[PDB]
Amino acid sequence: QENERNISRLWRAFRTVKEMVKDRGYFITQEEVELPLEDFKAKYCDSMGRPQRKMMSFQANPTEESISKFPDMGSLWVEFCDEPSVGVKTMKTFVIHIQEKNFQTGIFVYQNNITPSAMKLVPSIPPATIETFNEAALVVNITHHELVPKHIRLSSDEKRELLKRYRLKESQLPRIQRADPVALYLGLKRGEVVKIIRKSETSGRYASYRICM
Amino acid sequence: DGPTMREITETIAEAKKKVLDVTKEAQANLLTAKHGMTLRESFEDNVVRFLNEARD
Amino acid sequence: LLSKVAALSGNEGDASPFTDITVEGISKLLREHGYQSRGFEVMYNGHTG
Amino acid sequence: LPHFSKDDYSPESKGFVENSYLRGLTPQEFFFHAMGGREGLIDTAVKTAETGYIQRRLVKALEDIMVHYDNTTRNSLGNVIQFIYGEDGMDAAHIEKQSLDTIGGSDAAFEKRYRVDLLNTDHTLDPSLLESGSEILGDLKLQVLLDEEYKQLVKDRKFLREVFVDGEANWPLPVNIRRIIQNAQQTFHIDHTKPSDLTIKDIVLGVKDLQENLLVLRGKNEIIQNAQRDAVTLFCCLLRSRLATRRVLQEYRLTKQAFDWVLSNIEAQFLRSVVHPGEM
Amino acid sequence: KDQDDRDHFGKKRLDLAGPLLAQLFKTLFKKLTKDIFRYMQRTVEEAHD
Amino acid sequence: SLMSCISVGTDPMPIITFLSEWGMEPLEDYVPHQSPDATRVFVNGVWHGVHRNPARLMETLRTLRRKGDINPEVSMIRDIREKELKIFTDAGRVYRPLFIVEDDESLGHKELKVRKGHIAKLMATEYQDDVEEYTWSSLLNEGLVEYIDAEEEESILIAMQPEDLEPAEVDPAKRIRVSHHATTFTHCEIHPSMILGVAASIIPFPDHNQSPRNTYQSAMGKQAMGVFLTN
Amino acid sequence: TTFRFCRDCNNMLYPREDKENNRLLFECRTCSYVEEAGSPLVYRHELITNIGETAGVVQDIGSDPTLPRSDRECPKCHSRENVFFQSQQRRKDTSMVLFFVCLSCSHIFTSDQKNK
Amino acid sequence: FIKRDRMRRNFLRMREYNEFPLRAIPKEDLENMRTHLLKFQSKKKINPVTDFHLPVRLHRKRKTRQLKVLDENAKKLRFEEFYPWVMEDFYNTWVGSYEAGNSDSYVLLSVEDDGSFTMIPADKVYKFTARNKYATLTIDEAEKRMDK
Amino acid sequence: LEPGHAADQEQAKLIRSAIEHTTLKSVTIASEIYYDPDPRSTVIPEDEEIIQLHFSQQSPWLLRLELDRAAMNDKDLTMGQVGERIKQTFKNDLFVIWSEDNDEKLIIRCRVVAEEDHMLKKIENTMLENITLRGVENIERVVMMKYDRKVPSPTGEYVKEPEWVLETDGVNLSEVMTVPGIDPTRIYTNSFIDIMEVLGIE
Ligand SMILES: [Zn+2]
Ligand SMILES: [Zn+2]
């Protein structure tokens, strides 16, 4: 019943997560993404059958090519949360633990909602950041949708080349907003340029450039 | 030409006849409306359908 | 057309909107005066005759 | 109308008009038809009055945007809107519908058209097509070229499938090719039943070369050349299809001067089809 | 019952010259009357003429 | 429209008075539960009371209008389903004349009250210029023709042509018509063409034109040249 | 639903549970008047409502000239002279089922062959 | 087909019981007294004043030269009589109100011991509330409670 | 719908059943309130069968209501799953009974553990309006449409391939997007504002 269905939703979302994490350039194998629902249920569901999220939380490491292009990029930690509404104390734990392991970024998935205090404490560890996603929001990866053309984040060197070649100021680029689902998805930050390849019905391949607000 | 005229005439008349039958049916509550469409909606919809078909 | 008849017969026509006057009725009247019953008429070009 | 008893849904009552204008209308018909006409005059006045006030907004918003020499389409502030006008850089005046031959057709008929294999007996050219076809037969250097070419076309079909989902084979593109061929044929009196003097290395290297002389963005660097390619991508895919070796020799029977002059013109008109910077 | 129709013509009254001149002439004659009264106050309170 | 006219209105008092004498119960005695079926009675939106026999009442009134006792302009209505009888002596209503059809006859079915005798009695007047000058006022006092507003137009039923649609029962050229099946016609239209205004009246055969070409003609006909006045 | 009124207060009676006898009464809060209930029923909403369809039938309805006439015979008196009209309730989903009204016995009988 | 105007030429070429008397009282009595109907809203049908007990009573409960606005005699007199009457024992209380529309035509027929009658014209007509039945006067306090 | 199930009409009907907003008022013919002090025994002679079955301290007031069987059909429902819904709505404060599908008259009765009526009649509204029986909110009148779809053949030319597609009135994109059994990739709405919100700027 409801238990089973909830398991299903949680699984699909979990798939989405790995997908995004690979897209950011962290190493996960195709099969590791493609692990079927039955295997996942056995791996993280208890003998009663209820799933265990605290077992699901896991580390992501950068792919070699990624280290090559973005040397600064560090490893990532992913937590889920079992609490339906996330407590500030749990948030504190996540903050501390990440600072402990010295990851460059962190990701926290919540079930329903989080106390405003916990949200306020999120920007407390520069340069490290905390991306916060809702479980129910991640159920379906958006990028697989037809209307969403492929995105690519860029290296500053590549960027300075872009601006120089078109003779542009950053302001003059078409702008994209941080709250954008895609922006969240790739975990963009301000002044970071993305490339978009949209398939055109006139040119047939049309590049484009945008810059987070 | 006349033979065409009478042919048009009947071609309309039968259309009216169909409409009349739809009327009798729905008056007798024997008509079942298309889902999402109210009964009288489905009625008008049909009647107009027949009519434009006739004119064409 | 109706005018063309009124012209010939010397009786003004009744154009009143809703009546029993019918095109065929006119056509017959006109034919009686010897013109083509639909009002078409043979014309010659002015330049070349 | 007062002339009908209550709850009369017959189409005579609710306004069906049976008589044609030639026969005239009964009065309760006429009145209805006047109601319809009035609706037609009213809405027409509204649409006109409103549509103009849209025309003004669309103008005032878009009035400042022009196409700079760099071919970026960018408004007053210098803000980049499009990195290449219309994404292919082509003036809407010069563009025509054209048939994409690669996108449509069955697997088999497609291969039957574009595939040329000298080693296998199925798809080999008839030698009388071109003067040297006999000695050409079986030669490996050429068969390899044709292999690369054919693979190119196939992978292009894989592409166009991904671009156009429904696979509509007709799209606006510059430079009507069909008319160029026809003009050339009639021009030089291309004579069927006689062998061509075209070599295959002549054909393939002719096309692959001509592709390089189609230019929109003339900048020299990685980024620009990336755009230049992504700009001419589709049009190229059309071109290869129309100039495919089989299609050239079997159908058009072009001679040397014919095929040359065609390559020349295709590029010549092409460059005319690029937008003129300074355009508003 | 249906929502009442605002455009039912039997519920619209037309106003020709008569009703118009009635309205306007009313407010004129009020203004007139009132002015005569003011004049009476001025002459009686001031005892002139 | 040509025959349309605007009501100049009259005084309600004589009507309101007249009602009570014929048995209208004054409002203040009304006990809704005890007299459930009585038709309540409006005059110019003012509700003065009720009446228990609207049928006969409404007959009395209509008879008075047709005698010309009440000014014909007054428009009375009886809504059967609503249990209301409305009256308007008010000014500013619009009304058009019609023939009054009557079932009451020596012979069979219903017929218009106007008959040839009246007609010749009119054209005697017209062609003349014998006595008493039988004219529109006469036609209205004798109850042949009656004025009807849009309100009273609710409760009646109208026939387009007298001799087409009155009697109970085809070349291909003529237009197709409806039937006479309705036996209740209370009123018959004088002539349908009169639904046209002045501008349209000049259009020949406007039935055969698409409507907007009638409109454009209605406007353009106003600016044409032509002799405007003899003087 | 069919609520009564007080005596000499005339006001509507609000239902009062009797906890002593565990039975229902009717109180008038303006006075001491209370009387017994006649049914356990108190409130009925009736979302789907078929009443009002036949509304507006009047003793004089047979005199209405604007109403059409029909030749169908009455099931009771078998008089073929009758007047018909559609459901008086005005709503989108209101069916077009006719209501035939005889001019002899005044009886109301529908045209619906599905449900009667 | 055409319009016929030759109608000048056409019209010229064609043309046990019991009988009890009634009387109008000497007006002196009328001069002394005005007569007024009584009506109750009770719904309690009986309501004879005998039932109403007793003791019965029935009783009603510097500028410079400037402008006055004009008014009628009958209306002014009626308006000046705005203290309505009332009746009690020493408690049941009825409060009346001028009907105002029914003066109209009302003729009184008094049944006297002999079958003959006397007839007096009706002055006014009043409608008596039975007032203060449940006897809660909640006034300003009630409005304040309403402000909840 | 997903490509595998695109041809099936009945799977489609399942999804329509899984989205279109369903309210208790939609299926409710009428409701009525009764005074029945004894919790177990009911004065009503008809319902005594229900008393006999569905049984084998609480409010003296009864709330009772009747459903359209046609509504139970057009919108597929089960008297049980309904009573499930209400039970898991109000939890234990309101006892619940419901009649069988076999019953020619669909009946539902409920009671509760100082002017009780207004509180009960209040709860009646929460029942009709505030209970979403099943499906996604804001959506109405989901229409099955057979749309032809151009799809490559195994032999490579295109083939017109009819498939069942659900048009929809009202828009909530996120949830509908998440519902299992559909194809999240091709989902579409005609209001771009939401496309912007959910799927971003591009
Ligand atoms: Zn009371
Ligand atoms: Zn009968």
GROMACS .gro file of N, CA and C in nm, chain A residues 10-97:
model
  264
   10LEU      N    1   1.036   0.744  -0.342
   10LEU     CA    2   1.170   0.763  -0.288
   10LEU      C    3   1.277   0.705  -0.379
   11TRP      N    4   1.253   0.587  -0.435
   11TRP     CA    5   1.351   0.529  -0.525
   11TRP      C    6   1.372   0.616  -0.647
   12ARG      N    7   1.264   0.651  -0.718
   12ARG     CA    8   1.277   0.732  -0.838
   12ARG      C    9   1.355   0.860  -0.809
   13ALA      N   10   1.320   0.927  -0.699
   13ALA     CA   11   1.393   1.047  -0.661
   13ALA      C   12   1.540   1.016  -0.639
   14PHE      N   13   1.568   0.905  -0.570
   14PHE     CA   14   1.708   0.869  -0.547
   14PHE      C   15   1.783   0.854  -0.678
   15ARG      N   16   1.721   0.788  -0.777
   15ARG     CA   17   1.779   0.784  -0.910
   15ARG      C   18   1.813   0.924  -0.958
   16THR      N   19   1.714   1.014  -0.953
   16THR     CA   20   1.736   1.151  -0.998
   16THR      C   21   1.861   1.208  -0.934
   17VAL      N   22   1.880   1.180  -0.804
   17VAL     CA   23   1.989   1.243  -0.732
   17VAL      C   24   2.121   1.205  -0.797
   18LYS      N   25   2.146   1.074  -0.806
   18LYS     CA   26   2.269   1.027  -0.869
   18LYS      C   27   2.285   1.092  -1.006
   19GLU      N   28   2.177   1.097  -1.084
   19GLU     CA   29   2.185   1.157  -1.217
   19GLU      C   30   2.245   1.298  -1.211
   20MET      N   31   2.182   1.384  -1.132
   20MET     CA   32   2.233   1.519  -1.109
   20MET      C   33   2.379   1.519  -1.065
   21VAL      N   34   2.413   1.430  -0.972
   21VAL     CA   35   2.548   1.429  -0.917
   21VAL      C   36   2.650   1.393  -1.024
   22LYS      N   37   2.618   1.295  -1.109
   22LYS     CA   38   2.703   1.269  -1.224
   22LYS      C   39   2.713   1.392  -1.313
   23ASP      N   40   2.602   1.462  -1.333
   23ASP     CA   41   2.604   1.577  -1.423
   23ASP      C   42   2.696   1.686  -1.371
   24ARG      N   43   2.697   1.709  -1.240
   24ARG     CA   44   2.788   1.806  -1.181
   24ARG      C   45   2.934   1.766  -1.198
   25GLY      N   46   2.961   1.644  -1.243
   25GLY     CA   47   3.097   1.597  -1.259
   25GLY      C   48   3.149   1.506  -1.150
   26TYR      N   49   3.061   1.452  -1.065
   26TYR     CA   50   3.103   1.357  -0.963
   26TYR      C   51   3.086   1.215  -1.014
   27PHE      N   52   3.178   1.127  -0.975
   27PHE     CA   53   3.191   0.996  -1.037
   27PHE      C   54   3.086   0.900  -0.984
   28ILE      N   55   2.998   0.854  -1.073
   28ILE     CA   56   2.904   0.745  -1.046
   28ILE      C   57   2.888   0.667  -1.175
   29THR      N   58   2.889   0.534  -1.166
   29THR     CA   59   2.880   0.453  -1.286
   29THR      C   60   2.736   0.444  -1.336
   30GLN      N   61   2.724   0.417  -1.466
   30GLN     CA   62   2.594   0.401  -1.529
   30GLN      C   63   2.510   0.298  -1.454
   31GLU      N   64   2.569   0.181  -1.427
   31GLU     CA   65   2.494   0.077  -1.356
   31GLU      C   66   2.452   0.126  -1.218
   32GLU      N   67   2.545   0.189  -1.146
   32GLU     CA   68   2.515   0.244  -1.014
   32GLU      C   69   2.393   0.334  -1.019
   33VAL      N   70   2.378   0.412  -1.127
   33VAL     CA   71   2.256   0.489  -1.144
   33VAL      C   72   2.138   0.396  -1.172
   34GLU      N   73   2.160   0.291  -1.250
   34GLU     CA   74   2.052   0.212  -1.306
   34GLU      C   75   2.006   0.100  -1.214
   35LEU      N   76   2.057   0.096  -1.091
   35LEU     CA   77   2.021  -0.006  -0.994
   35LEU      C   78   1.870  -0.017  -0.978
   36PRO      N   79   1.811  -0.134  -1.002
   36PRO     CA   80   1.665  -0.146  -1.006
   36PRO      C   81   1.600  -0.131  -0.869
   37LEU      N   82   1.467  -0.111  -0.874
   37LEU     CA   83   1.391  -0.085  -0.752
   37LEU      C   84   1.401  -0.201  -0.654
   38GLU      N   85   1.396  -0.325  -0.703
   38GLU     CA   86   1.404  -0.438  -0.612
   38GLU      C   87   1.537  -0.439  -0.538
   39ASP      N   88   1.646  -0.413  -0.611
   39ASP     CA   89   1.777  -0.411  -0.548
   39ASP      C   90   1.784  -0.300  -0.445
   40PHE      N   91   1.730  -0.183  -0.478
   40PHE     CA   92   1.732  -0.072  -0.384
   40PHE      C   93   1.652  -0.104  -0.259
   41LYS      N   94   1.535  -0.166  -0.277
   41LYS     CA   95   1.452  -0.199  -0.163
   41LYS      C   96   1.524  -0.296  -0.072
   42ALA      N   97   1.591  -0.396  -0.129
   42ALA     CA   98   1.664  -0.488  -0.043
   42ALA      C   99   1.779  -0.417   0.028
   43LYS      N  100   1.850  -0.330  -0.044
   43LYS     CA  101   1.965  -0.260   0.012
   43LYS      C  102   1.932  -0.164   0.126
   44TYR      N  103   1.823  -0.088   0.115
   44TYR     CA  104   1.794   0.010   0.219
   44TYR      C  105   1.661  -0.004   0.293
   45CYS      N  106   1.578  -0.100   0.258
   45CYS     CA  107   1.457  -0.126   0.335
   45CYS      C  108   1.484  -0.229   0.444
   46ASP      N  109   1.430  -0.204   0.563
   46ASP     CA  110   1.452  -0.294   0.675
   46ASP      C  111   1.369  -0.422   0.657
   47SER      N  112   1.384  -0.514   0.753
   47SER     CA  113   1.306  -0.638   0.749
   47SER      C  114   1.157  -0.608   0.755
   48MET      N  115   1.118  -0.506   0.832
   48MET     CA  116   0.980  -0.461   0.831
   48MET      C  117   0.937  -0.412   0.693
   49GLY      N  118   1.031  -0.361   0.615
   49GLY     CA  119   1.003  -0.306   0.483
   49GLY      C  120   1.011  -0.155   0.474
   50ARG      N  121   1.013  -0.084   0.587
   50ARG     CA  122   1.029   0.060   0.583
   50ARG      C  123   1.170   0.096   0.537
   51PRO      N  124   1.185   0.196   0.451
   51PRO     CA  125   1.319   0.231   0.402
   51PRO      C  126   1.399   0.306   0.507
   52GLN      N  127   1.531   0.295   0.496
   52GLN     CA  128   1.625   0.361   0.585
   52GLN      C  129   1.702   0.465   0.504
   53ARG      N  130   1.673   0.593   0.527
   53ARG     CA  131   1.743   0.699   0.454
   53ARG      C  132   1.882   0.724   0.511
   54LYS      N  133   1.897   0.721   0.643
   54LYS     CA  134   2.028   0.744   0.702
   54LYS      C  135   2.132   0.645   0.652
   55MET      N  136   2.088   0.530   0.602
   55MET     CA  137   2.178   0.440   0.532
   55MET      C  138   2.203   0.485   0.389
   56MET      N  139   2.110   0.561   0.331
   56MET     CA  140   2.119   0.600   0.190
   56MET      C  141   2.219   0.712   0.167
   57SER      N  142   2.236   0.801   0.265
   57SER     CA  143   2.324   0.916   0.248
   57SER      C  144   2.465   0.870   0.213
   58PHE      N  145   2.530   0.941   0.121
   58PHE     CA  146   2.654   0.888   0.065
   58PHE      C  147   2.740   0.999   0.010
   59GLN      N  148   2.866   0.964  -0.017
   59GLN     CA  149   2.968   1.054  -0.066
   59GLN      C  150   2.978   1.049  -0.218
   60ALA      N  151   3.008   1.164  -0.278
   60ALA     CA  152   3.036   1.176  -0.420
   60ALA      C  153   3.175   1.234  -0.442
   61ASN      N  154   3.253   1.171  -0.532
   61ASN     CA  155   3.388   1.216  -0.561
   61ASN      C  156   3.400   1.266  -0.705
   62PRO      N  157   3.486   1.364  -0.730
   62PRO     CA  158   3.492   1.426  -0.862
   62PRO      C  159   3.553   1.334  -0.966
   63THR      N  160   3.502   1.341  -1.088
   63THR     CA  161   3.560   1.267  -1.200
   63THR      C  162   3.691   1.332  -1.245
   64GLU      N  163   3.783   1.249  -1.293
   64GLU     CA  164   3.916   1.297  -1.331
   64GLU      C  165   3.908   1.414  -1.428
   65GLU      N  166   3.828   1.400  -1.534
   65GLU     CA  167   3.812   1.510  -1.629
   65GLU      C  168   3.767   1.636  -1.558
   66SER      N  169   3.676   1.622  -1.462
   66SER     CA  170   3.627   1.736  -1.386
   66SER      C  171   3.739   1.802  -1.309
   67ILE      N  172   3.818   1.724  -1.234
   67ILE     CA  173   3.934   1.782  -1.166
   67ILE      C  174   4.024   1.856  -1.265
   68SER      N  175   4.045   1.797  -1.382
   68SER     CA  176   4.123   1.863  -1.487
   68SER      C  177   4.066   2.000  -1.526
   69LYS      N  178   3.935   2.009  -1.548
   69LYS     CA  179   3.878   2.137  -1.592
   69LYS      C  180   3.856   2.237  -1.479
   70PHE      N  181   3.806   2.191  -1.365
   70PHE     CA  182   3.782   2.275  -1.248
   70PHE      C  183   3.871   2.219  -1.137
   71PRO      N  184   3.999   2.257  -1.135
   71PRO     CA  185   4.088   2.202  -1.031
   71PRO      C  186   4.038   2.228  -0.891
   72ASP      N  187   3.974   2.342  -0.870
   72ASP     CA  188   3.930   2.381  -0.737
   72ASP      C  189   3.824   2.287  -0.682
   73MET      N  190   3.752   2.217  -0.770
   73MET     CA  191   3.638   2.136  -0.730
   73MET      C  192   3.678   2.029  -0.629
   74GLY      N  193   3.608   2.027  -0.515
   74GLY     CA  194   3.627   1.926  -0.413
   74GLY      C  195   3.512   1.827  -0.406
   75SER      N  196   3.530   1.728  -0.318
   75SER     CA  197   3.433   1.621  -0.302
   75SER      C  198   3.306   1.671  -0.235
   76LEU      N  199   3.200   1.592  -0.250
   76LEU     CA  200   3.065   1.629  -0.209
   76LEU      C  201   3.009   1.526  -0.113
   77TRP      N  202   2.931   1.572  -0.015
   77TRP     CA  203   2.857   1.484   0.074
   77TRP      C  204   2.708   1.502   0.052
   78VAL      N  205   2.634   1.391   0.060
   78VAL     CA  206   2.489   1.393   0.044
   78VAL      C  207   2.426   1.331   0.168
   79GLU      N  208   2.340   1.408   0.235
   79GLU     CA  209   2.250   1.354   0.335
   79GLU      C  210   2.105   1.361   0.287
   80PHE      N  211   2.028   1.261   0.328
   80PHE     CA  212   1.884   1.270   0.331
   80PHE      C  213   1.844   1.303   0.475
   81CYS      N  214   1.714   1.303   0.503
   81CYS     CA  215   1.668   1.321   0.641
   81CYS      C  216   1.546   1.234   0.666
   82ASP      N  217   1.546   1.166   0.781
   82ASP     CA  218   1.430   1.087   0.821
   82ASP      C  219   1.322   1.170   0.887
   83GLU      N  220   1.359   1.279   0.953
   83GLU     CA  221   1.260   1.364   1.017
   83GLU      C  222   1.167   1.424   0.913
   84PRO      N  223   1.036   1.415   0.930
   84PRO     CA  224   0.945   1.478   0.832
   84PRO      C  225   0.965   1.628   0.821
   85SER      N  226   0.973   1.698   0.934
   85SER     CA  227   1.013   1.838   0.936
   85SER      C  228   1.150   1.845   1.001
   86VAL      N  229   1.246   1.904   0.931
   86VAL     CA  230   1.385   1.894   0.972
   86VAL      C  231   1.411   1.989   1.089
   87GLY      N  232   1.470   1.936   1.195
   87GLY     CA  233   1.503   2.017   1.310
   87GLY      C  234   1.632   2.095   1.291
   88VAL      N  235   1.637   2.211   1.356
   88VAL     CA  236   1.757   2.294   1.353
   88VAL      C  237   1.876   2.214   1.403
   89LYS      N  238   1.855   2.127   1.502
   89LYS     CA  239   1.964   2.047   1.557
   89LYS      C  240   2.022   1.955   1.450
   90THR      N  241   1.935   1.883   1.378
   90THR     CA  242   1.977   1.803   1.263
   90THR      C  243   2.056   1.886   1.162
   91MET      N  244   2.004   2.004   1.128
   91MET     CA  245   2.077   2.094   1.040
   91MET      C  246   2.217   2.123   1.092
   92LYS      N  247   2.226   2.164   1.219
   92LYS     CA  248   2.355   2.185   1.283
   92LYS      C  249   2.446   2.065   1.264
   93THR      N  250   2.397   1.945   1.295
   93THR     CA  251   2.473   1.823   1.272
   93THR      C  252   2.529   1.816   1.130
   94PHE      N  253   2.443   1.833   1.030
   94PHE     CA  254   2.486   1.833   0.890
   94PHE      C  255   2.596   1.936   0.862
   95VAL      N  256   2.576   2.059   0.910
   95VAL     CA  257   2.677   2.165   0.898
   95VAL      C  258   2.809   2.121   0.959
   96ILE      N  259   2.806   2.082   1.086
   96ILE     CA  260   2.927   2.044   1.156
   96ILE      C  261   2.995   1.931   1.081
   97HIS      N  262   2.922   1.824   1.056
   97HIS     CA  263   2.979   1.704   0.996
   97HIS      C  264   3.050   1.737   0.866
   0.00000   0.00000   0.00000
